[PDB]
Amino acid sequence: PIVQNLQGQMVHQAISPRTLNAWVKVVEEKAFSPEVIPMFSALSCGATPQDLNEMLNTVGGHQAAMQMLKETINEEAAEWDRLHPVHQMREPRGSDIAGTTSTLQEQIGWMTHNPPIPVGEIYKRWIILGLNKIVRMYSPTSILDIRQGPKEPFRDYVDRFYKTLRAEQASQEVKNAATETLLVQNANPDCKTILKALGPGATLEEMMTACQ
Amino acid sequence: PIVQNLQGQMVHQCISPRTLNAWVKVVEEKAFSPEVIPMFSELSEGATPQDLNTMLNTVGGHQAAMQMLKETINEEAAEWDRLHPVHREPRGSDIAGTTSTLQEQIGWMTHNPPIPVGEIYKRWIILGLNKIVRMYSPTILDIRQGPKEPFRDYVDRFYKTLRAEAATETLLVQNANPDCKTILKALGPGATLEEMMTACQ
């Protein structure tokens, strides 16, 4: 990230071995589970593009996924160039934000300018866009296949439903009319009848309590 | 969280890897035991709404609970909007950090007078966590050791539940998880609690 030195100059603070190891381990242990995306974002708080590239490079497996990610990154960089024609410092182009044609010092200059040109945050946005695609792709189930079954508690079924909906779906804000109705429809008849009796506008709190 | 520069300016202090991991681990190990509430509040000291969202979003399992929490949050945001008509002032989703930027949140939180959006949002979150603790409250037959719950924490819950409600201790062993159960069974009958806890330490 960025830090200020004894001479007052803004300089790079190298990313920490604790952060690197935490990141490498999350990926080893959780692969492209949906919760890896918030985790990557938090671990990369205040990263320059160089730092972001450092983090992406430490992934050892998943080379197909990492290639797909490069593709998405190049697509966003091209869209940036399309929307930002080039006529303080010089203006960053797409590949500069992605850190492949920009120097660390230039990145620091952009990020710490007044007003700041947040190339670290812009690049992170592109990366998470690509990561989300991968999370979606690696989801092996369709919400539809999540049905309650025989002697599974309602709570466990809701757990699986929203876990799956976080995967085959981009992110965690889900909960449409569609999803509530699907949620009820895929419960077993006992619960379904209880929930239907609840009337529309039932909270998930009320739904879980009723079926407890 | 938030910190001031020597140049006077309020800036963001990134949430630490140690804090992030501690949170994720507490949830993995303790599920929705009541002591999750104090611990969350400690871990989130001085948090901006962005940080609070980071903490909630890094939770991977327990998606029923996390969905309920979103529901409670949206309810409090709507109640905020009901009591704070807008004529800048933060709206509900701004306090919940979904429609406000970090810089805006920092501005509100460090203004004079402060609009403590971090504290307001934390209040909503703990309200929702409390609902979950209440929901997952087992009333003794429904106290069974969790997958990755430390044995000590499980025994705490077991005797706390017995408190609210070889007889109970039989059930204690029976309701322990497979890994610990194997260890305890090998211990032989008449093992003291100290011995059991050391064994599964």
Quote the tokens at residue A103.
Answer: 């120097």
Residue in the structure block whose two tokens are 């025994």: B155
Looking at residue A136, its amino acid is: R
CB-nearest to B58 from A19, A38, A203 is A38
Alpha carbons within 13 A on the beta-carbon side of A153: 10
- CA B22 remoteness from chain centre: 11
3-state secondary structure A129-192: HHHHHHHHHHCCCCHHHCCCCCCCCHHHHHHHHHHHHHHCCCCCCCCCHHHHHHHHHCCCHHHH
**Contact predicate B57/A38, CB 8 Å:** yes
The answer to whether the Cβ–Cβ distance between A38 and B18 falls below 8 Å is no
- Tell me the C-alpha distance between B55 and B49, whole Å: 10
SS3 (DSSP) at B92: helix
ω into A17 cis (within 30 of 0): no
Residue numbers followed by a gap, chain A, C–N over 2.5 Å: 87
Break chain A into its structural domains and give their ranges: 1-142, 143-212
- Tell me the C-alpha distance between B58 and B37, whole Å: 17
Alpha carbons within 13 A on the beta-carbon side of A66: 12
CB-nearest to A208 from B20, B64, B66 is B64
B15 contacts chain A (CB < 8 A) = yes
Q: Which residue of A has its CA nearest to B62?
A: A159
- Tell me the C-alpha distance between A167 and A139, whole Å: 5
Q: Where do the H-state alpha helices sit in A31-141?
A: 36-43, 49-57, 63-83, 94-97, 104-111, 119-138
Looking at residue A24, its amino acid is: V
- Tell me the C-alpha distance between A175 and A139, whole Å: 18
- CA B17 remoteness from chain centre: 17
Other CB atoms within 10 Å distance of the CB of residue A75: 14
Give me the resolution in angstroms, 1 decimal.
3.4
- What is the sign, positive or negative, of the torsion defined by CA atoms of A198, A171, B39, B35? positive
CB-nearest to A209 from B17, B64, B135 is B135
| The domain made up of B2-136 is a member of CATH 3.20.20.140 | no
Task: Break chain B down into helix, strand, coil percent, rounded to 5.
Answer: 60, 5, 35
**Contact predicate A76/A126, CB 8 Å:** yes
Residue in the structure block whose two tokens are 């949170």: B23
A34 contacts chain B (CB < 8 A) = yes
- Beta pairing partners, B29: none
Other CB atoms within 10 Å distance of the CB of residue B22: 14
Q: Which of A53, A50, A1, A62 is nearest to A26 (CA)?
A: A62
- Tell me the C-alpha distance between A50 and A100, whole Å: 9
Quote the tokens at residue A22.
Answer: 């935490």
- Tell me the C-alpha distance between B133 and A73, whole Å: 42
SS3 (DSSP) at A4: strand
- CA B82 remoteness from chain centre: 28
Which residues of chain A neighbour B66 with C-beta distances below 8 Å? 162, 172
Other CB atoms within 10 Å distance of the CB of residue A134: 20
The answer to whether the Cβ–Cβ distance between A155 and B64 falls below 8 Å is yes
Q: What is the DSSP letter of B90?
A: P
- Beta pairing partners, A10: A4
Quote the tokens at residue A51.
Answer: 């730092």
- Beta pairing partners, B4: B10
- Tell me the C-alpha distance between B92 and B78, whole Å: 6
- Tell me the C-alpha distance between B46 and B41, whole Å: 9
Other CB atoms within 10 Å distance of the CB of residue B92: 23
